[PDB]
Amino acid sequence: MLKGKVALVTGASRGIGRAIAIDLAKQGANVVVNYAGNEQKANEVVDEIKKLGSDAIAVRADVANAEDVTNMVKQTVDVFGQVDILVNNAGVTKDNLLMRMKEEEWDTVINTNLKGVFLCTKAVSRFMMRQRHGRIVNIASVVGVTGNPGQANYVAAKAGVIGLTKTSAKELASRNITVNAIAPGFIATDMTDVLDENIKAEMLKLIPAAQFGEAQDIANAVTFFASDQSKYITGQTLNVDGGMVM
Amino acid sequence: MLKGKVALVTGASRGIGRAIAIDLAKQGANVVVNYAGNEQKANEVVDEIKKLGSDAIAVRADVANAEDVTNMVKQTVDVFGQVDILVNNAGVTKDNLLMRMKEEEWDTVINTNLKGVFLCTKAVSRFMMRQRHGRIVNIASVVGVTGNPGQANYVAAKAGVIGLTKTSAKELASRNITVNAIAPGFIATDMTDVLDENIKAEMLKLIPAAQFGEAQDIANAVTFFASDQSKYITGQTLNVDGGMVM
Amino acid sequence: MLKGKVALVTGASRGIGRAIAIDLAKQGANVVVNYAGNEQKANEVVDEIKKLGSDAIAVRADVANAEDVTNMVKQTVDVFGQVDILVNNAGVTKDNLLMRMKEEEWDTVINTNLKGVFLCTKAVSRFMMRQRHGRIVNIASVVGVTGNPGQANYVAAKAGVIGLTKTSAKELASRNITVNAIAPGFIATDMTDVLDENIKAEMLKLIPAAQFGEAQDIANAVTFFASDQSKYITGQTLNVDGGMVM
Amino acid sequence: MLKGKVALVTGASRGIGRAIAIDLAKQGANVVVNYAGNEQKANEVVDEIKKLGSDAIAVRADVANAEDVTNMVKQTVDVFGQVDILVNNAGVTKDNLLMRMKEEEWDTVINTNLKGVFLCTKAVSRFMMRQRHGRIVNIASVVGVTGNPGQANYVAAKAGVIGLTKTSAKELASRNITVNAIAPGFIATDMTDVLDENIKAEMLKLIPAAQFGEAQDIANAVTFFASDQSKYITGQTLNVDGGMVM
């Protein structure tokens, strides 16, 4: 219950990122709702956070852009006084068979999903190291652990994030900062995209829970890691996937 | 907030097991405090649980003994009406280098730490499958993941528990029962034998957190798994170890 | 190339164990073909090894029995002068859903598959430690990594073996003994068990190679670990499974 | 035993890459020795390969450069008729603490180590899928599995490679192409610039083998994966590290 904490959530305007922002606010956090493109959705998330008694601002930044990231973190600290929690949820997919995959499809996914984590982690570190506390939680993917045929770029990025999480955990331990990852499986708000009722039905056979997850399942896990009580957990990846990857 | 839940915690009379029993009770559960030996410590845990507004009973059973286990689960259901949560924390250590390790040292550790999980999981399954809900959380050890020179028996047992957790998760998922494991690192309560300060200091070097954990760290993780909100997490092992094993 | 080496292979009378025995002999090893009750078949394996220019003997031992194991190792050293390689392949399955699994089904699988590895590793260590070289390779199963619904006992046993492998690797490393595990997937001779095409075809979809393995696939990997050239590999588990577990 | 095979080895002019090139040639492969910088060392490797009876050419390509890669693969097929084996060994390190690490230090390491694997895999797949056979082996690092304080960029890259390996294994299986990774530990030719006795001694304590590896240890493993006999192994990572990461 995050009272007096401030959280910066990247890619917070919908789905998982939105559910995370809202849940953090519910536990008492002030929230920076980052978005890349659509201001309108981000503003809705801000409105909802204010409704439930917390404070929030919407900030536009490309997490693959060093200057954007620097200004975003700076705004957070300017408006809310500090940064206590970073959740790295920004990321795109550009699926294709390896043989079909364009160099720019590769670059855009790696830069957004992996380099964003690097850039954001780097930018918040100085503030967290100085204050001698912090939480970083990186949203990876179970596909980063097992691989996945359509997604060489995305798998590489998310596997990279899981590794980056461990280096960060190790480097920041001395200043009471924990760094952990959540690896979602197949969550409903990620699959507004995939509507073929056969590709869907097969995916579902892979899950012992026999159902797709919900955005709140990921928020539940993030909030647990963001909390003071989980202080002795660092460098870990928790799969939230209905048993798909064990 | 486990309201109306009933939990059976094996090896609950002290240290980690005790902290688990108390935290579950704190969240509203009625608790069965299992013990093997002297009943005084178990009775203290029961007294504490009643103090904080919940209900509890102390039940003696060797978890390696089929009839003891059967009777224990039966008592739980008889007294409290049902069983909602099982945490398998019973276990002994009998350390020795492999080539000196006695066969009985091996057997006792395997039977207590591994067979106990089997037996207790089997015993509660009927009840949980019928009611169509449940939580099982197994206390393993980070040493099960990495290996450890003094502890062939213990490492084998705990690695086995981690695998058993996955089979259970898979078998029980269709009935809304989740099964997960917590792998503790070096926790202060479980380090009473270790007063050799050169073993301690070199152990401590292995932990990025640069400190030993506390029993409550394990309780917080168990409670998270035992809760309704973690419903989409199954077959997973969470290391609570200050970053020791990543 | 295994010239002048002597190998003890437990459960060597057929399938994977047989293929291992034969391949080791092919590379120049003298082989002890261990069996539990199938002497007919152990003698055939012995005959085949002698045909290809090597030497072998068949030795009955229950690997769960300390007296048998000690007898067996001693016979190896008595007949062939030394023991250079141990492959632990003995093991039974007794499948059942957790809720139905008998205590004796549990015990027999744990004792054969897990305690056998302990007992045999213990028995050979002193010889290997004294001569300051050795290879131990443990045959586990990919099911020990992922879990598997029908097989709580088998999964627990094989997960345990993978952990035991690491402790052994660590304890024996400075006497230039390496200890590694092979985790087979679905191998054809290993599924004389299954003839039912319902479960059989469901298994095949899980394998990217889109076909079951052969006993020789496991032998090829064992022989690689058994060789002098793999000296810098220890405590590892290699999945031989057509890509089923990545 | 690689008779009639042709191998393309990236970063093959020295150390691990060179040992790999030479060992493949030893087993009968014709080899393309790729280099980035000055062509001299690459020419020496080529000379050595010819001495031992095989054929080779040295080819300049930035593995992060799409056109370079495309031309390199095309030259391979033009000169040697086909490509049967790809080993991705190209890669740089640019170490720094996260909060000191430059954006270009990040980029250069990610592009060379991770994007190079993508680009080369893509380029050869074309030819391997058609002929319906191939071997890709990616050289990762054990640091990609555990994390490592000085090396956020390198860890992210190598963790990414391990994931990319799995996607590739899965996509290429239907055309009888296997894709695996070797994760080296601390190998003597990788450590020239670790001059400090203090930093060396501590690294060594982490290795149960109590010694650094040699380039040939990696070549041993690569050759095993490149061979026909390892056909049922795909999507796997093998640590060659003296027991450092179990």
Residue D140 CA to residue D161 CA, distance in Å, equals 6
Chains within contact range of chain A (3+ C-beta pairs < 8 Å): B, C, D
Helix (H, G, I), strand (E, B) or coil at A238: strand
Residue A128 CA to residue A136 CA, distance in Å, equals 10
Q: Bin B40: left if φ > 0, else alpha if -120 < ψ < 50, else beta.
A: alpha
Rg, chain D, Cα only: 17
Chain C residues close to D184, C-beta within 8 Å: none
Residue C120 CA to residue C65 CA, distance in Å, equals 10
Alpha carbon C26 to its chain centroid, in Å, reads 18
Which residues of C lie closer than 8 Å to D, measured between beta carbons?
166, 169-170, 173-174, 208-210, 213-214, 217, 220-221, 224, 229-236, 238-243, 246
Residue C211 CA to residue C197 CA, distance in Å, equals 14
**DSSP 8-state code for residue C112:** I
**Contact, C237 vs C181, CB < 8 A?**
yes
Q: How was this structure determined?
A: X-ray
Nearest to C208 among D208, D220, D234 (CB): D234
**Contact, D159 vs D145, CB < 8 A?**
yes
Beta bridge partners of A96: A151
Residue B233 known to bind ligand: no
**Contact, D235 vs D204, CB < 8 A?**
no
Residue A44 CA to residue B203 CA, distance in Å, equals 50
Residue A243 CA to residue B176 CA, distance in Å, equals 12
Write the DSSP assignment of chain D as a string of letters.
--TT-EEEETT-SSHHHHHHHHHHHHTT-EEEEEESS-SHHHHHHHHHHHHTT--EEEEE--TT-HHHHHHHHHHHHHHHS---EEEE-------B-TTT--HHHHHHHHIIIIIHHHHHHHHHHHHHHHHT-EEEEEE--THHHH--TTBHHHHHHHHHHHHHHHHHHHHHGGGTEEEEEEEE-SBGGG-TT---HHHHHHHHHT-TT-S-B-HHHHHHHHHHHHSGGGTT--S-EEEESTTS--
Q: B with C: how many residue pairs have Cβ under 8 Å apart?
A: 135
Determine, for residues C147 and B163 on separate chains, whether the beta-carbon distance falls below 8 Å.
yes
Determine, for residues C156 and B118 on separate chains, whether the beta-carbon distance falls below 8 Å.
yes
Q: Give the closest-approach CA distance of B157 to chain C in angstroms.
A: 6
Q: How many helices (H) and strands (E) does chain A have?
A: 9, 7
- Dihedral sign, Cα of residue A198, residue B229, residue A137, residue A181: negative
Secondary structure, 3-state, chain B: CCCCCEEEEECCCCHHHHHHHHHHHHCCCEEEEEECCCHHHHHHHHHHHHHCCCCEEEEECCCCCHHHHHHHHHHHHHHHCCCCEEEECCCCCCCECCCCCCHHHHHHHHHHHHHHHHHHHHHHHHHHHHHCCEEEEEECCCHHHHCCCCEHHHHHHHHHHHHHHHHHHHHHHHHCEEEEEEEECCEHHHHCCCCCHHHHHHHHHCCCCCCCECHHHHHHHHHHHHCHHHCCCCCCEEEECCCCCC
The amino acid present at D61, given as its one-letter code, is: A
Q: How far is CA D239 from CA C135, D78, D182, in A?
A: 17, 35, 6
Residue C145 known to bind ligand: no
| CB atoms closer than 10 angstroms to residue C130 | 11
Q: Give the closest-approach CA distance of C67 to chain D in angstroms.
A: 32
Alpha carbon C168 to its chain centroid, in Å, reads 15
Q: Give the closest-approach CA distance of B9 to chain A in angstroms.
A: 21
Separation of first and last alpha carbons in chain A: 29
Q: For C122, phi and psi rounded to 5 degrees?
A: -60, -45
- The answer for residues whose C-beta is within 8 angstroms of residue B69's C-beta and 6 or more apart is B61, B63, B116, B119, B120, B123
Residue B126 CA to residue D135 CA, distance in Å, equals 49
Residue B89 CA to residue A86 CA, distance in Å, equals 34
Instruction: HSE, CB side, 13 Å, CA atoms: give it for residue C164.
Output: 32
Residue D144 CA to residue D155 CA, distance in Å, equals 5
Locus of tokens 């290429």 = D172
What residues of D are designated binding site for NADP(+)?
11-14, 89, 154-158, 187
**Contact, A118 vs D156, CB < 8 A?**
yes
Q: Which domain holds residue C193?
A: 1-246
- At residue A69's C-alpha, the angle toward residues A66 and A74, to 5°, is 125
What's the length of chain B?
246
Helix (H, G, I), strand (E, B) or coil at C174: helix
Residue C235 CA to residue D241 CA, distance in Å, equals 10
**DSSP 8-state code for residue A241:** S
What's the length of chain D?
246
The amino acid present at D230, given as its one-letter code, is: S
Name the percent of chain A in helix, strand, coil, to the closest 5. 50, 15, 35
Residue C48 structure tokens:
């085949």
Helix (H, G, I), strand (E, B) or coil at A93: coil
Chain B residues close to A229, C-beta within 8 Å: 216-217, 220
Determine, for residues A155 and D170 on separate chains, whether the beta-carbon distance falls below 8 Å.
no
- Dihedral sign, Cα of residue D40, residue D46, residue D50, residue D52: positive
Task: Provide the b/e sequence for D90-125 (b: ≥16 CB within 10 Å).
Answer: bbbbbbeebbebeeebbbbbbbbbbbbbbbbbbbbb
Separation of first and last alpha carbons in chain D: 30
Instruction: HSE, CB side, 13 Å, CA atoms: give it for residue C70.
Output: 5
Helix (H, G, I), strand (E, B) or coil at C80: helix
Chains within contact range of chain C (3+ C-beta pairs < 8 Å): A, B, D
The amino acid present at A30, given as its one-letter code, is: N
Alpha carbon A60 to its chain centroid, in Å, reads 16
Q: C with D: how many residue pairs have Cβ under 8 Å apart?
A: 83
Residue B13 known to bind ligand: yes
Q: How far is CA D147 from CA A164, B243, D192, in A?
A: 7, 11, 21
Residue C125 CA to residue C69 CA, distance in Å, equals 13
The amino acid present at B51, given as its one-letter code, is: K
**Contact, C171 vs B149, CB < 8 A?**
yes
Mutate to test the interface with D, among A69, A86, A98, A117 (most CBs of D within 10 A): A98
Q: How far is CA D167 from CA A96, A147, C101, D120, in A?
A: 11, 4, 37, 14
Beta bridge partners of C238: C182
Mutate to test the interface with A, among B204, B232, B237 (most CBs of A within 10 A): B232
Strand ordering across the sheet containing A177-184 = A56-60, A30-35, A6-10, A85-88, A134-139, A177-184, A237-240
Residue D122 CA to residue A97 CA, distance in Å, equals 9
**Contact, C163 vs B159, CB < 8 A?**
yes
Residue C199 structure tokens:
């479960």
**Contact, C240 vs C183, CB < 8 A?**
yes
Q: How far is CA D108 from CA D33, D35, D62, in A?
A: 22, 16, 11
Closest CA to A90 of A119, A70, A67: A119
Residue C242 CA to residue D29 CA, distance in Å, equals 25
Nearest to B173 among A166, A209, A230 (CB): A209
- Number of structural domains chain C divides into: 1
Q: For A100, phi and psi rounded to 5 degrees?
A: -105, -15
**DSSP 8-state code for residue A180:** E
What's the length of chain A?
246
Catalytic residue among A106, A154, A186, A225: A154
Instruction: HSE, CB side, 13 Å, CA atoms: give it for residue D159.
Output: 31
Q: Gap positions in chain D, given as the residue before each gap (C–N > 2.5 A)?
A: none
Q: Give the closest-approach CA distance of D55 to chain A in angstroms.
A: 29
Q: How far is CA D97 from CA A78, A118, B245, D150, D231, in A?
A: 26, 12, 21, 5, 41
Residue B94 CA to residue D238 CA, distance in Å, equals 32
Residue C78 structure tokens:
């008595």
Residue B131 CA to residue D42 CA, distance in Å, equals 69
- At residue D51's C-alpha, the angle toward residues D46 and D52, to 5°, is 105
Closest CA to D152 of D204, D191, D107, D213: D107
Q: How far is CA D10 from CA B125, C5, D24, in A?
A: 55, 37, 13
- Residue A209's closest chain B neighbor by CA? B173
**Contact, D89 vs D24, CB < 8 A?**
no
- Dihedral sign, Cα of residue B239, residue B243, residue B244, residue B245: positive
Closest CA to C183 of D182, D233, D243, D165: D233
**DSSP 8-state code for residue C36:** S
| CB atoms closer than 10 angstroms to residue A54 | 20
| CB atoms closer than 10 angstroms to residue C126 | 11
Element (H, E) at C157: helix C152-172
**Contact, D173 vs C210, CB < 8 A?**
yes
Q: How far is CA B62 from CA B36, B116, B135, in A?
A: 5, 8, 22
Chain C residues close to A147, C-beta within 8 Å: 246
On the 0-12 / 13-18 / 19+ scale of CB atoms within 10 A, D224 is buried
**DSSP 8-state code for residue A206:** T
Chain D residues close to A152, C-beta within 8 Å: 118, 164, 167-168, 171
Q: B with D: how many residue pairs have Cβ under 8 Å apart?
A: 4
Nearest to C159 among B119, B151, B162 (CB): B162
Residue D156 CA to residue D141 CA, distance in Å, equals 11
Residue A86 structure tokens:
């970073």
Residue B91 structure tokens:
């276990």
Determine, for residues B103 and C121 on separate chains, whether the beta-carbon distance falls below 8 Å.
no
Residue B158 known to bind ligand: yes
Residue A220 CA to residue A227 CA, distance in Å, equals 11
Residue C146 CA to residue B133 CA, distance in Å, equals 23
Residue numbers of D annotated as active site: 154
**Contact, A244 vs A207, CB < 8 A?**
yes
**Contact, B200 vs B181, CB < 8 A?**
no
Q: Give the closest-approach CA distance of B202 to chain D in angstroms.
A: 11
**Contact, C208 vs D170, CB < 8 A?**
yes
Element (H, E) at C225: helix C215-226
**Contact, C7 vs C22, CB < 8 A?**
no
Residue D35 CA to residue D14 CA, distance in Å, equals 9
- The answer for residues whose C-beta is within 8 angstroms of residue C104's C-beta and 6 or more apart is none
Closest CA to A114 of D157, D105, D166, D120: D157
Chain B residues close to D146, C-beta within 8 Å: 246
Closest CA to B227 of D39, D170, A217, A7: A217
Closest CA to D217 of B71, C231, B206, C51: C231
Residue D64 CA to residue A107 CA, distance in Å, equals 11
Beta bridge partners of D239: D183
Chains within contact range of chain D (3+ C-beta pairs < 8 Å): A, B, C
Chain D residues close to C234, C-beta within 8 Å: 208-209, 242-243
Residue D125 CA to residue D111 CA, distance in Å, equals 20
Q: How far is CA D52 from CA D46, D47, D48, in A?
A: 10, 9, 7
Strand ordering across the sheet containing D30-35 = D56-60, D30-35, D6-9, D85-88, D134-139, D177-184, D237-240
Residue D211 CA to residue D111 CA, distance in Å, equals 31
Mark out the alpha helices in chain A (DSSP H runs). Answer: 15-26, 39-51, 66-80, 103-110, 116-131, 143-146, 152-172, 199-205, 215-226
Chain D residues close to A121, C-beta within 8 Å: 98
**Contact, B94 vs B153, CB < 8 A?**
yes
Beta bridge partners of A184: A240
Chains within contact range of chain B (3+ C-beta pairs < 8 Å): A, C, D
Locus of tokens 């795909």 = D234
Residue B108 CA to residue C97 CA, distance in Å, equals 25
Chain C residues close to A246, C-beta within 8 Å: 146-147
Residue D156 CA to residue A159 CA, distance in Å, equals 8
- What is the CATH number for B180? 3.40.50.720
Catalytic residue among C154, C186, C212, C225: C154
Residue B150 CA to residue B134 CA, distance in Å, equals 36
